[PDB]
Amino acid sequence: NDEIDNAKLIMKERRFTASYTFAKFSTGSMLLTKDIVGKSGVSIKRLPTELQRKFLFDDVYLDKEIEKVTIEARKSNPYPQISESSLLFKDALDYMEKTSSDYNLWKLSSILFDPVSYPYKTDNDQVKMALLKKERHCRLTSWIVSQIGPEIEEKIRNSSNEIEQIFLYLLLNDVVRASKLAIESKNGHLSVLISYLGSNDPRIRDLAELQLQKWSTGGCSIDKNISKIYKLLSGSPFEGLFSLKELESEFSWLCLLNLTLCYGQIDEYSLESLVQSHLDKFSLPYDDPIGVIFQLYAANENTEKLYKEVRQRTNALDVQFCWYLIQTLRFNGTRVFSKETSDEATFAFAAQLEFAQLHGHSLFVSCFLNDDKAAEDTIKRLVMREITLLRASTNDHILNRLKIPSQLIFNAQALKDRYEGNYLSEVQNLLLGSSYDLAEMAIVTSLGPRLLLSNNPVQNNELKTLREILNEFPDSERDKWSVSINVFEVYLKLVLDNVETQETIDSLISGMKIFYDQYKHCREVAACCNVMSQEIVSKILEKNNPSLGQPEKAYLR
Amino acid sequence: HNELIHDAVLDYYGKRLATCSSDKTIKIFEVEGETHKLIDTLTGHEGPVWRVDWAHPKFGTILASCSYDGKVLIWKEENGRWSQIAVHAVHSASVNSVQWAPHEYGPLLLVASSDGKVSVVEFKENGTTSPIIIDAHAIGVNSASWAPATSRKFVTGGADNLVKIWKYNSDAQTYVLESTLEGHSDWVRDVAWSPTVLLRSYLASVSQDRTCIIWTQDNEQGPWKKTLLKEEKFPDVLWRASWSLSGNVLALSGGDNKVTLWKENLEGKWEPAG
């Protein structure tokens, strides 16, 4: 009761309230959100993962992304970077589910954001180059055609004009079938016209144009779909005298992209310019993810600007995906992209990978900071922070074997196992471990009252087999000895052989005096120097003041 | 039941949850799942013990904890049997913060109290606690914390509403007053410098008028842009907060027992994350 009002007036000096909460971050970046009922009085919360792809949880998919990458031994900093990302978007099409426009999204970038080429050389350069774009076009139009699959098949089933069915067959790219239905309407001359298609040529455009115009200055009544057949024939599906807006209220904008790439000339233009003229005509959403693929194939030329803007408008692509495009196509160079686009998307992606406790995969991503200090601090920090997450795989442990100096990660390891609660065997693993490359000062101060466990000849000669390593490795941090570790040269040759002082005894009383200073925090380590003294000078009549009273140095009396 | 906890920080390796409560004990629940196992009850302090802070290893781990009384007891393991090494008892009001430095700077313990003082409690192997006192505010300093962004500062936030960037000189092993920021009607409770691994640093000025003003810099020396997390008077006086090491999720605790995790999207403006 007394406690209640006490803590009230205390916490109103403090200007705290009687209900309080905190949650703070830790070594795997996770929360300790106080709730009041626990015996730790926290509920350790997972911070939500903003990246939840089911094929990150394969570590061989970490390894596929290392192999489509040329790893760069970098010369501003020793830590790994990437010289060349030729990263494929076909490396997740074997771990992904295969139904989803997540699969079609990632496939669309497999035709566009990774190359497509024709295998063997055709004789002229203009022809060679056209057959890369024609090969890319075979896959691409398959894609366009596949995805307008249901909407066209729905209207096949439904009641339709005869010429509305010929037009819809042609949308799924069927030519013979369309001719055969032309044949059935008793129209032979028409069926000739359906069997130009799949092909345009320049003379039929001028005749198709001349005939639509004959109609205008002609009488009344026309069919619309018949007018559509001549729009294909004019070579010009939208860029003729009529523009098709009857199929963006009934069909998609993708149903429009089929019309340019198949009857809006068949790659006598480049792809890139065709899809760009087709953005300008029809606004391809900034909100569909498969939409934005088209848009940054259209704006290949100066990608960076339109990419920043639409990354705010499409969040049904994940932060993985946004990062992937900058990586692949910046060391290929086809998309203008700064370094700092890659540096912002690296931080972001790596940071979500960390919230899933995928820090191996985080490491690999933070390597694609190709600003020099940025992959100094990030690589350093992420290894020194967590060790067991980076030995959780062998592929993890390869990324520390990579261009990282054993050295970093053993330095993380034994920094961790340096406590005071296990500390005899793991302060040995700074010296035995040798990433600190001599650091046995704290082994002096961890072998004070740990010669009080047993004295036997190779526990005696353990302090002359980690003290010969004093000189095998040159003086490094905390080091330069052979007064305080000329104690244990001659502690051996004292208690073995009765000695008339060889004057390394005279180094060792000084060394015990140095050792009294050092206690590095433990109960007694500055009175264990007495123990080791009063063990041994006492091999001449010599009494000297301790390292108290006279039996604390010598054991003569 | 556990009495009202006021901090429970974890190790640098993520093991020893230090629940320092209004029972005057820091209960070291060394974490193995839900077997947060009580390895020591740290009886010493004479009022409600508010903050813990662990040092990163280089010697062990040294827990430094602070309390109402004025005692920051320098807890260190001797084979897990924790005791004070020494006592830093210099502070005559309720001590706010305790907070260990990276070992780029040294083992420098940064202690502030709302008696006005901020001591750079420089530590040594001979088990001494060495204060380099400045008085940064005079209605009290309610936090002080370092600035290990890529450098070398501590920021103060206190009771006179000022937020003073103490940037480096080390002319004495205390830093000089670079600038002074202002924009609150009530006490800057917590100054949460971003411990990011990139050039940008932010500073969530978590306050008692409940304006969590994140002054957004785009660099070390950059502009102090008023782009508040919460741009209103959010319910109950806002308690302690930190920035993620990587991901920049402002874990803005309330006093309303919700922690508004509010990640960053690139424009220096803030959208939810739980």
Side-chain angles (χ1 to χ4, degrees):
Chain A
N1 177 37
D2 69 335
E3 292 308 299
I4 300 307
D5 76 289
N6 193 21
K8 291 277 194 51
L9 307 171
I10 294 177
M11 286 197 294
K12 295 308 311 175
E13 160 150 321
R14 185 71 169 155
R15 203 187 167 168
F16 286 176
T17 47
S19 59
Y20 192 104
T21 196
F22 50 94
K24 295 174 165 285
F25 281 90
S26 300
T27 189
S29 58
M30 58 165 181
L31 293 305
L32 301 159
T33 308
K34 187 208 194 310
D35 282 348
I36 317 175
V37 303
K39 37 159 263 50
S40 290
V42 285
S43 291
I44 310 181
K45 292 196 173 176
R46 174 63 290 124
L47 197 174
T49 20
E50 296 79 55
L51 178 73
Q52 314 188 109
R53 309 318 184 87
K54 40 278 182 219
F55 57 97
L56 309 170
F57 306 148
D58 181 28
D59 294 300
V60 183
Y61 163 72
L62 186 53
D63 193 38
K64 284 318 286 69
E65 276 177 87
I66 304 161
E67 285 276 336
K68 299 308 169 181
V69 143
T70 315
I71 290 278
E72 178 177 32
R74 184 59 150 185
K75 303 296 309 312
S76 189
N77 61 333
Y79 308 125
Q81 293 197 359
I82 281 75
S83 183
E84 164 78 285
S85 175
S86 309
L87 285 174
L88 303 183
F89 297 78
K90 307 182 179 51
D91 283 332
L93 307 205
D94 61 318
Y95 306 126
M96 290 173 62
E97 53 208 1
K98 314 300 182 197
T99 283
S100 59
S101 293
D102 194 30
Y103 194 68
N104 297 331
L105 166 64
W106 282 59
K107 185 175 54 159
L108 191 50
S109 58
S110 292
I111 315 158
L112 306 185
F113 306 171
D114 293 327
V116 190
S117 59
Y118 190 70
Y120 57 88
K121 176 75 146 57
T122 62
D123 303 344
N124 282 153
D125 202 20
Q126 53 204 303
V127 177
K128 175 54 164 180
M129 291 178 311
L131 277 168
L132 321 179
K133 53 186 193 179
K134 272 305 289 73
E135 184 62 68
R136 182 178 320 266
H137 162 241
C138 297
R139 281 160 64 115
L140 186 57
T141 199
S142 299
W143 200 95
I144 302 174
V145 164
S146 62
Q147 306 304 312
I148 66 178
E151 68 194 66
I152 301 302
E153 300 172 43
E154 277 283 344
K155 292 260 185 37
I156 295 168
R157 158 73 183 78
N158 289 341
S159 62
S160 293
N161 192 204
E162 296 269 66
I163 314 292
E164 189 189 85
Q165 288 291 60
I166 293 168
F167 175 59
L168 287 165
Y169 298 159
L170 286 164
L171 279 146
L172 300 181
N173 292 176
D174 185 346
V175 152
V176 188
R177 194 176 78 191
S179 295
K180 279 169 49 191
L181 183 61
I183 290 272
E184 283 285 82
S185 67
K186 289 200 296 180
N187 299 353
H189 296 311
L190 178 75
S191 73
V192 193
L193 311 180
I194 303 307
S195 57
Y196 306 144
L197 307 177
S199 165
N200 290 338
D201 57 79
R203 288 62 51 73
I204 54 180
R205 306 180 187 114
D206 299 338
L207 289 168
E209 291 279 39
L210 171 55
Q211 180 55 333
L212 291 171
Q213 292 177 256
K214 213 60 61 61
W215 299 0
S216 54
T217 193
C220 45
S221 311
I222 34 155
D223 287 351
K224 311 302 300 172
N225 325 129
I226 301 181
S227 196
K228 291 182 178 66
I229 304 316
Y230 283 100
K231 308 307 302 165
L232 318 181
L233 299 158
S234 56
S236 46
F238 310 116
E239 297 176 73
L241 49 71
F242 183 53
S243 289
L244 307 175
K245 295 296 194 314
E246 293 103 307
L247 311 157
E248 182 152 33
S249 291
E250 175 167 69
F251 299 133
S252 56
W253 51 265
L254 190 67
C255 201
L256 321 164
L257 202 63
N258 194 251
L259 307 175
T260 19
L261 287 45
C262 282
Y263 311 122
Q265 296 43 264
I266 316 176
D267 298 345
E268 305 329 285
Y269 294 66
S270 55
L271 277 163
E272 288 189 30
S273 56
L274 214 30
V275 64
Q276 169 61 249
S277 62
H278 184 80
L279 177 57
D280 292 4
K281 290 188 275 296
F282 312 99
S283 44
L284 308 187
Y286 315 97
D287 292 325
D288 294 336
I290 53 168
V292 308
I293 300 300
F294 288 112
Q295 290 183 119
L296 301 168
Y297 199 62
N300 186 257
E301 294 114 302
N302 166 229
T303 314
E304 202 196 306
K305 174 298 300 309
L306 191 53
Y307 177 79
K308 285 182 155 287
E309 294 183 18
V310 304
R311 183 40 183 71
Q312 295 316 124
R313 282 182 291 203
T314 323
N315 293 151
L317 37 98
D318 74 346
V319 69
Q320 184 176 206
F321 190 63
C322 86
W323 170 105
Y324 225 95
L325 164 64
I326 309 178
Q327 285 346 291
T328 301
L329 293 175
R330 186 166 57 84
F331 289 118
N332 294 0
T334 53
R335 304 295 180 66
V336 174
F337 274 121
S338 54
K339 289 291 173 180
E340 301 151 281
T341 67
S342 169
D343 297 328
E344 74 197 48
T346 275
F347 293 126
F349 177 47
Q352 312 316 299
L353 279 172
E354 296 163 12
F355 306 164
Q357 312 312 123
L358 308 183
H359 291 18
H361 201 324
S362 300
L363 184 70
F364 188 70
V365 171
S366 295
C367 301
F368 295 97
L369 307 158
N370 311 102
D371 293 11
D372 294 345
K373 220 287 164 74
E376 282 178 12
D377 188 7
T378 54
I379 305 289
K380 174 181 49 71
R381 176 277 318 180
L382 190 55
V383 186
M384 284 306 280
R385 175 170 79 155
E386 264 317 308
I387 296 101
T388 39
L389 307 184
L390 292 191
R391 304 167 169 275
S393 306
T394 190
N395 177 72
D396 295 357
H397 191 211
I398 271 150
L399 297 166
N400 305 108
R401 287 184 278 223
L402 184 78
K403 306 296 192 300
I404 291 185
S406 291
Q407 191 173 102
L408 205 57
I409 179 141
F410 279 175
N411 276 340
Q413 187 164 61
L415 191 45
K416 179 173 196 175
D417 297 333
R418 165 157 57 190
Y419 286 150
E420 286 299 295
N422 56 354
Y423 188 48
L424 184 56
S425 53
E426 308 298 336
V427 72
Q428 291 179 343
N429 288 4
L430 319 169
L431 176 80
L432 303 167
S434 46
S435 46
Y436 294 89
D437 201 357
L438 200 52
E440 62 186 69
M441 163 285 170
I443 311 183
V444 178
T445 45
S446 208
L447 280 168
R450 281 65 160 159
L451 273 157
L452 300 179
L453 291 190
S454 51
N455 279 2
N456 105 111
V458 297
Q459 174 60 30
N460 300 137
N461 199 223
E462 187 173 60
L463 300 57
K464 238 297 194 275
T465 53
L466 274 57
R467 304 318 204 194
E468 298 163 340
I469 307 185
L470 178 55
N471 312 119
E472 290 161 39
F473 297 148
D475 298 314
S476 288
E477 42 188 278
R478 310 191 291 179
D479 303 317
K480 180 60 194 48
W481 302 105
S482 288
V483 165
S484 199
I485 312 184
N486 196 1
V487 173
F488 309 114
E489 169 166 303
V490 76
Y491 175 114
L492 274 156
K493 312 186 184 171
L494 272 154
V495 300
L496 294 168
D497 302 9
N498 181 18
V499 68
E500 287 293 288
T501 48
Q502 51 176 349
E503 308 186 280
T504 55
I505 298 87
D506 298 10
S507 300
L508 139 152
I509 301 176
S510 173
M512 285 171 166
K513 302 180 166 62
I514 283 172
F515 185 26
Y516 191 81
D517 319 328
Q518 310 190 120
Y519 66 84
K520 314 306 188 198
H521 308 285
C522 182
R523 291 305 188 80
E524 294 287 2
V525 170
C528 295
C529 302
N530 304 9
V531 187
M532 50 180 66
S533 62
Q534 80 192 148
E535 179 58 62
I536 61 80
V537 81
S538 295
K539 312 326 185 163
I540 54 157
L541 174 53
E542 163 163 320
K543 297 192 160 292
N544 54 98
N545 309 336
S547 70
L548 298 151
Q550 39 106 42
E552 315 183 14
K553 162 52 48 67
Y555 70 106
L556 292 158
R557 306 289 173 97
Chain B
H1 151 274
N2 194 1
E3 289 90 304
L4 193 81
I5 310 98
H6 291 269
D7 193 25
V9 181
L10 281 159
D11 233 32
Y12 177 55
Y13 299 95
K15 278 194 56 44
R16 279 165 291 283
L17 189 62
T19 75
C20 52
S21 298
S22 293
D23 55 16
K24 324 178 176 47
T25 23
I26 317 75
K27 296 174 301 318
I28 313 303
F29 294 123
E30 182 170 74
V31 178
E32 296 100 45
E34 289 285 313
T35 310
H36 346 82
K37 183 60 176 169
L38 180 54
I39 50 150
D40 206 5
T41 193
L42 294 171
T43 319
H45 297 292
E46 303 175 297
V49 39
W50 326 114
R51 294 198 67 160
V52 282
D53 202 293
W54 302 101
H56 312 17
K58 44 166 306 298
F59 34 30
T61 40
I62 297 184
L63 168 42
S65 193
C66 65
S67 195
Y68 177 67
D69 38 12
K71 294 183 87 185
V72 180
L73 296 144
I74 314 288
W75 297 102
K76 193 171 181 80
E77 32 179 358
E78 294 98 353
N79 305 108
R81 302 196 301 270
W82 306 80
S83 51
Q84 78 287 289
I85 302 286
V87 197
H88 159 269
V90 169
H91 290 310
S92 50
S94 168
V95 188
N96 287 256
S97 44
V98 64
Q99 185 42 256
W100 291 98
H103 305 312
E104 167 190 320
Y105 297 56
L108 320 174
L109 190 33
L110 185 66
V111 184
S113 185
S114 54
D115 64 344
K117 289 188 171 76
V118 182
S119 299
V120 188
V121 177
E122 183 154 59
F123 178 88
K124 318 182 169 309
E125 291 318 295
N126 309 121
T128 316
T129 20
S130 304
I132 301 89
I133 312 175
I134 47 147
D135 293 354
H137 289 120
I139 302 172
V141 179
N142 309 131
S143 64
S145 55
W146 297 98
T150 40
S151 64
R152 294 196 63 168
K153 319 163 179 189
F154 73 94
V155 50
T156 66
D160 59 354
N161 296 355
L162 308 171
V163 184
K164 291 187 183 183
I165 313 299
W166 303 84
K167 187 172 158 65
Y168 163 94
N169 287 349
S170 289
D171 45 40
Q173 188 49 287
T174 196
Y175 300 163
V176 79
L177 178 48
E178 168 174 281
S179 55
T180 304
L181 309 176
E182 189 166 84
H184 315 291
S185 58
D186 288 317
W187 298 354
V188 189
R189 171 55 60 178
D190 209 23
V191 285
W193 203 264
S194 293
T196 53
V197 291
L198 51 153
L199 186 79
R200 298 197 62 151
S201 21
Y202 316 131
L203 176 44
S205 185
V206 168
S207 207
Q208 300 301 94
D209 63 342
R210 299 94 73 219
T211 33
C212 177
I213 312 186
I214 309 150
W215 316 104
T216 310
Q217 327 181 264
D218 84 323
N219 47 304
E220 271 297 295
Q221 299 311 113
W224 309 113
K225 306 184 286 179
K226 170 157 178 172
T227 24
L228 333 67
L229 192 71
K230 306 283 195 169
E231 295 173 55
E232 57 191 291
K233 306 307 169 190
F234 178 77
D236 301 341
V237 279
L238 312 173
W239 305 139
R240 309 297 186 163
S242 51
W243 291 108
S244 298
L245 287 61
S246 290
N248 308 308
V249 186
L250 196 68
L252 176 76
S253 305
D256 60 355
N257 192 350
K258 170 72 176 193
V259 183
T260 59
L261 300 153
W262 264 49
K263 76 190 282 203
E264 171 177 62
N265 69 258
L266 171 57
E267 50 195 7
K269 191 52 52 181
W270 319 102
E271 204 151 89

